[PDB]
Design a binder for these strands. Structure first.
Lengths: 184, 26, 125, 133, 755
RNA sequence: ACGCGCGCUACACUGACGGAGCCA
RNA sequence: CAUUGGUGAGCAGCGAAGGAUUUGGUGGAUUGGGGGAAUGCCUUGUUGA
């Protein structure tokens, strides 16, 4: 039911990709860090089909626009590639706050159910790690048309005051290539 | 009536599962 | 028609094909006898199928092999594999079964996968 | 009639009669289970399971509606579940004739078992494992 | 082990058609199968005669007047003779045509066969030795009739043969050229087809029965001749009278039906005594005991494979099952009970040491694929094609749990730990393996590691290792109880189906995709690959099992053959089934080291290590006389009687040399036995114990031996494992006797003090 | 005015210089 | 250059006054589903002799 997520980059990460992969590692009890000794193996289909996993995340960098995230659901094969805003130097965080088994509440703003809805399913289908389903933190997905923003906040009540807690990195992605997948 | 119809249709369904199951592994 | 078989083998990326026909005892590598291989250190590794079974064992045999692909070392793990299954698959068909087991029993005691190719499938534990 | 007898290399004439009786049982099951009030979950659940098991049997390889149950279930559909027609359409032999010529004399294998019967049937999920000897 | 392994039992009673009869003793049941003849004794069912010259699978059978002669007839018309212990005394192709019935005299002089359109009677040979090329002599033959002879009846004079015919008529035959009353007069007037006739044992009533239910009574008036006396007409019963047999009590009738019910009547009264139903499957034939106390009737092959024994005061003596072709076998931890799995979806327990059909369980919706015991002796897990697995305990007869939970229609392999914590099953059509805790049926994980259908699974006695053989040239090893997982090897060859484990956790036996059967350890050193599976009347590798002492494995495919192997290369012995149209589908090894099993489509098990063979273990004959030197060591030197007569192995000596030594001598003997003469006597006590009534006597032996060498059998394991199991079953089966009844005289004295 | 971090380039005596062999 | 496929002539060796390939008959042993009536039928009631 809950997915099994694998994270992978090119053979040459620097520090700025290392800490970034450390933040992306922080979506566990099902997020695992792993490099390849080739750049990207073409046998990853036997890797995921043999391992039985469902989803794959790839970090790389190209020069059509700058740096790129890639998400794919493995057996069917839809694959969204997204573009990032900032990869320069994020926070060196690998675990702080709670654990990532805590399923937060999930917020989508600026409802577009015309053609971004396939995205809104996948983000629902990704972040259901853990048996919690009871909110301790919160993750925010802000549409601004084709600009989205990512937030992580912790509930800080004070004298029954609903104060947010900014933690972790602040992302702002754009819809890059989204390949029309299959029923296969 | 309705219970009778569920009786005979559940009968022929039980027979039909058997007849296809003969071809299922042979 | 002459009695002949054909096997082949492969390490990491190189592949190597072997014919086995009845003859007078020659072992060639693409144009060249077996004593030439160069890396020059690892030549005992391709001698390995000969002395594990015995020096003679070839007196009505001819062997030629050839090499495609690979780096320096990984060509040699191919051709030591190809002569290994090559020799056995001759004994399959014209010599008795019981010679073949004695090859299989002697090789597999010393087995550095002379009869199976290694294949890597990495996996998150 | 005998068009079907000649198209699929039937070794007999009895087989068209037998599959005609089985398809008759399926049609009268369809009619009797059809004539109920359509909100009765008996009818919905049992026609649904009949659809799913007829997916698995490979007869309705086409993904279906309810009304296909009157429409498509013929003798020739289950006759296309016979082994050499699976063999030909899996592009092993060249004609259906030569496929039957191979199964007459033992070269074909489903799973780990030898086959020599031209009336063994395959599922929609056993046909992955067909090779030679 | 070298012993002559041969068939002397079979797996469940009646699969096939035939006649059926008792002995004259009333304690021996004669109930054939099609292929051989299985004569039970009524108390403690055992197996006596095992012919095999039958090339065709039907019998006709009878014994003479004391059981010293048995025949059996198949379709072709050749017969085979045995005396008491299957000597196979005589053999005789008798006819190119088939036989309908065979009947002796009560005198053993004459012999009766019905065939074709004739009637043969033969002069009976006595018991002797052989030395006849043709032992049977023709006495007379009688011509003629109009068509076939279907039933036969003998009289008390041994002068008087009453026989029916197929042409709706009956005839009479004087044996000794007397022309008894100068008449062989026919019987006619029968509207319907004749199923049998009988001659009453007071020489005045001649009896006929027809297929409709009609019964006709003629008198011994030969005004002058035959007159009818009592007629009937049945039009509304509307079945067919299939079989008929008449009482030697000469008062009662028995009538069998196609409809599936059992009729009893009286001869001149025509009262209805009782009728009984057992199904809808037709009654094939019925025969009565010689005193009317016991009834037995056989049921036809396509219908019930069941034979009941009903008395005239209406209670069923022996009930039974024995259904069709079998999927799976496993031995209980006590070496006495054997599970079977049938195609129709039951699970039956067979006490094949004693022929009972003990108990059943029926919750399956379709066929059963896998059975295996847990090592506690408490529980056994069944696997099905139902889409679920379930648990069972023995005489609580109650289903613990039915594990399932993912959508599935096929499971194919079931294995559990010795620890009893976790149960694993391998889906034939998922590329994954399932585990369950037996506490709840919680799902722990789903261990995704294969690429083909997983097809055989077993554990280890080390019990940290899971052996997982899938059908994609890949053998795998698993950790379940640590804090990580493992790396899993690759085969060299040839897709595997059959996996079998050593009870050490150190050796794994695999069956490659041809006749080569191969072994390698847990550091993948491939020891042997072994040669093909012969005997066509293509080649396969279906099941394989590691024997319990750690010195042998047994291979069974589907090619009328079964092979023995040791740990080194050699082919030990090839046993095989002769019959005519798979056979073998499962084989496992007994914990008594006396025999093992092979699940065949016929159904046939035993191997039976015996001791009639002269083994010479440690220079037997330097101890020159087995008699007089042992006679010297019965007067003196009781340490040397054991070592002397133990190197000797006449079983007709070990009773006396073992019995005769005194009680006070026993701890001195056991303290000074050699360590090389130990296991054969520890195995000898474990199978001699179950027979006699010397419980005190053998118990002081096992006190001395188990008190003597405990650490030596603690370290030198895996043979005293087998012997120790054999003695422990005797200990528990006597303990639960005398503790029960000694309790039942332990309440009494204080119950006197009560009031 | 400056700072922080990533890549990129040197310092090694596993040194130079010359050939010959040879694998994706 | 690859005793590489087809084809033909010779030699060592093996055997000696015949050899190699191919085929016929013969004997022994084994081997039917959904709707409908006139008409006809079936069942049942009736009407007159």
């Amino acid at each position: 039911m809950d997915p099994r997520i694998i994270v992978t980059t090119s053979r040459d990460p620097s520090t700025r990709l290392s800490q970034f992969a450390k933040e992306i590692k922080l979506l566990f009890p099902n997020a695992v860090r792993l490099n390849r000794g080739n750049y990207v193996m073409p046998n990853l289909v036997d890797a995921c089909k043999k391992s039985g996993t469902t989803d794959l995340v790839v970090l790389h960098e190209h020069r059509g626009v700058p740096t790129s995230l890639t998400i794919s659901h493995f057996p069917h094969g839809p694959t969204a590639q997204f573009s990032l805003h900032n990869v320069v130097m994020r926070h060196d965080i690998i675990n702080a706050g709670n654990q990532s088994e805590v399923n937060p509440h999930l917020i989508f703003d600026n409802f577009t159910t015309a053609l971004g809805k396939r995205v809104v399913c996948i983000l629902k289908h990704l972040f259901n790690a853990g048996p919690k389903k009871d909110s301790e933190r919160v993750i925010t997905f802000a549409n601004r048309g084709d600009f989205i923003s990512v937030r992580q906040h912790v509930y800080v009540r004070t004298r029954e005051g609903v104060e947010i807690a900014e933690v972790g990195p602040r992302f702002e992605m754009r819809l890059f290539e989204l390949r029309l997948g299959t029923l296969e | 009536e309705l219970q009778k119809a569920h009786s005979e249709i559940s009968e022929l369904y039980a027979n039909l599962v058997y007849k296809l199951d003969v071809l299922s592994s042979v | 028609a002459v009695p002949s078989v054909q096997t082949f083998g492969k390490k990491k990326s190189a592949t190597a094909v072997a014919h086995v026909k009845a003859g007078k005892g020659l072992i060639k590598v693409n144009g060249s006898p077996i004593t030439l291989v160069e890396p020059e250190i690892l030549r005992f590794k391709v001698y390995e199928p000969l002395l594990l079974v015995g020096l003679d064992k070839f007196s009505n045999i001819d062997i030629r092999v050839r090499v495609t692909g690979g780096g320096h070392v990984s060509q040699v793990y191919a051709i030591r594999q190809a002569i290994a299954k090559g020799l056995v698959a001759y004994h399959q068909k014209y010599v008795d079964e019981q010679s073949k087991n004695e090859l299989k029993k002697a090789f597999t005691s010393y087995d550095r996968t002379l009869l199976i190719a290694d294949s890597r499938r990495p996996e998150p534990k | 009639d005998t068009q079907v007898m000649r198209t699929y290399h039937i070794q007999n004439r009895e087989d068209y009669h037998k599959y005609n009786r089985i398809c008759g049982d399926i049609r009268r099951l369809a009619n009797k289970l059809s004539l109920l009030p359509p909100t009765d979950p008996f009818r919905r659940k049992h026609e649904q399971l009949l659809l799913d098991k007829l997916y698995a049997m490979g007869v309705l390889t086409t993904k279906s509606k309810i009304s296909d149950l009157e429409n498509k279930v013929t003798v020739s559909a289950i006759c296309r579940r016979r082994l050499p027609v699976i063999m030909h359409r899996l592009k092993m032999a060249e004609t259906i004739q030569d496929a039957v010529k191979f199964i007459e004399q033992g070269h074909v294998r489903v799973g780990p078992n030898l086959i020599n019967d031209p009336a063994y049937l395959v599922t929609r999920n056993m046909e992955d494992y067909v090779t030679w000897v | 082990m070298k012993s002559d392994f041969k068939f002397s039992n079979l797996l469940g009673t009646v699969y096939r058609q035939g006649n059926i009869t008792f002995s004259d003793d009333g304690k021996q049941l004669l109930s054939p199968v099609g292929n051989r003849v299985s004569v039970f004794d009524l108390i403690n069912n055992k197996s006596f005669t095992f012919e095999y010259e039958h090339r065709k699978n039907i019998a006709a059978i009878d014994l003479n007047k004391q059981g010293t002669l048995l025949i059996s007839i198949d379709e072709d018309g050749r017969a085979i003779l045995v005396n008491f212990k299957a000597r196979n005394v005589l053999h005789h192709f008798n006819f190119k045509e088939k036989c309908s019935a065979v009947k002796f005299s009560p005198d053993g002089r004459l012999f009766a066969l019905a065939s074709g359109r004739f009637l043969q009677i033969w002069k009976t040979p006595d018991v002797n030795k052989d030395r006849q090329f043709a032992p049977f002599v023709r006495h007379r033959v009688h011509a003629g009739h109009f068509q076939d002879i279907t039933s036969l009846t003998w009289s008390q004079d041994s002068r008087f043969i009453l026989t029916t015919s197929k042409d709706l008529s009956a005839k009479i035959w004087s044996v000794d050229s007397e022309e008894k009353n100068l008449a062989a007069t026919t019987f006619n007037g029968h509207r319907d087809y004749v199923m049998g006739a009988f001659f009453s044992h007071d020489q005045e009533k001649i009896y006929t029965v027809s297929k409709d239910g009609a019964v006709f009574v003629w008198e011994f008036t030969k005004k002058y001749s035959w007159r009818i006396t009592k007629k009937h007409f049945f039009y509304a019963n509307q079945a067919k009278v299939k079989c008929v047999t008449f009482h030697p009590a000469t008062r009662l009738l028995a009538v069998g039906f196609t409809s599936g019910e059992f009729r009893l009547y009286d001869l001149p009264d025509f009262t209805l005594i009782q009728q009984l139903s057992m199904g809808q499957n037709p009654v094939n034939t019925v025969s009565v005991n010689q005193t009317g106390e016991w009834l037995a009737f056989g049921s036809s092959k396509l219908g019930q494979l069941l034979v009941y024994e009903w008395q005239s005061e209406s209670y069923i003596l022996k009930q039974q099952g024995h259904f069709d072709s079998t999927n799976s076998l496993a031995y209980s931890p006590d070496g006495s009970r054997v599970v079977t799995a049938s195609e129709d979806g039951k699970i039956k327990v067979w006490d094949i040491t004693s022929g009972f059909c003990l108990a059943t369980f029926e919750e399956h919706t379709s066929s059963v694929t896998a059975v295996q015991f847990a090592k506690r002796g408490q529980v056994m897990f069944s696997s099905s094609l139902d889409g679920t697995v379930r648990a069972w305990d023995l005489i609580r007869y109650r289903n613990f749990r039915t594990f399932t939970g993912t959508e599935r229609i096929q499971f194919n392999c079931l294995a559990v730990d010795p620890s009893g914590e976790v149960v694993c099953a391998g889906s034939l059509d998922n590329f994954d393996i399932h585990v369950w805790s037996v506490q709840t049926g919680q799902l722990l994980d789903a261990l995704s590691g294969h690429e083909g259908p997983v097809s055989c699974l077993s554990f280890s006695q080390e019990n940290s290792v899971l052996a997982s053989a899938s059908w994609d040239k890949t053998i795998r090893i698993w950790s379940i109880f640590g804090r990580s997982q493992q790396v899993e090897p690759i085969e060299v060859y040839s897709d595997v189906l059959a996996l079998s484990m050593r009870p050490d956790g150190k050796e794994v036996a695999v069956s490659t995709l041809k006749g080569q059967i191969s072994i390698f350890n847990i550091e993948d050193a491939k020891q042997v690959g072994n040669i093909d599976c012969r005997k066509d009347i293509s080649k396969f590798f279906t099941t394989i099992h590691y024997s319990f002492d750690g010195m042998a494995i047994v291979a069974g495919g589907n090619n009328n053959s079964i092979c023995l192997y040791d740990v080194p290369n050699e082919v030990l012995l090839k046993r095989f089934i002769v019959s005519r149209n798979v056979r073998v589908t499962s084989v496992q090894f007994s914990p008594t080291a006396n025999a093992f099993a092979a699940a065949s489509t016929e159904g046939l098990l035993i191997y039976s290590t015996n001791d009639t063979i002269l083994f010479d273990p440690f220079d037997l004959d330097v101890d020159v006389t087995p008699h007089s030197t042992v006679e010297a060591l019965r007067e003196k030197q009781f340490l040397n009687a054991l070592v002397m007569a133990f190197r000797l192995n006449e079983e007709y000596l070990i009773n006396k040399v073992y019995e005769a030594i005194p009680i006070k001598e026993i701890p001195l003997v056991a303290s000074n036995i050699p360590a090389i003469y130990l296991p054969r006597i520890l195995k000898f006590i474990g199978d001699f114990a179950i027979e006699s009534q010397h419980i005190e006597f053998n118990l002081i032996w096992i006190k001395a031996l188990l008190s003597a060498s405990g650490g030596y059998i603690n370290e030198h394991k895996y043979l005293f494992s087998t012997a120790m199991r054999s003695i422990q079953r005797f200990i528990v089966r006597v303990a639960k006797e005398v503790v029960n009844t000694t309790t039942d005289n332990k309440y009494t004295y204080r119950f006197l003090v009560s009031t």
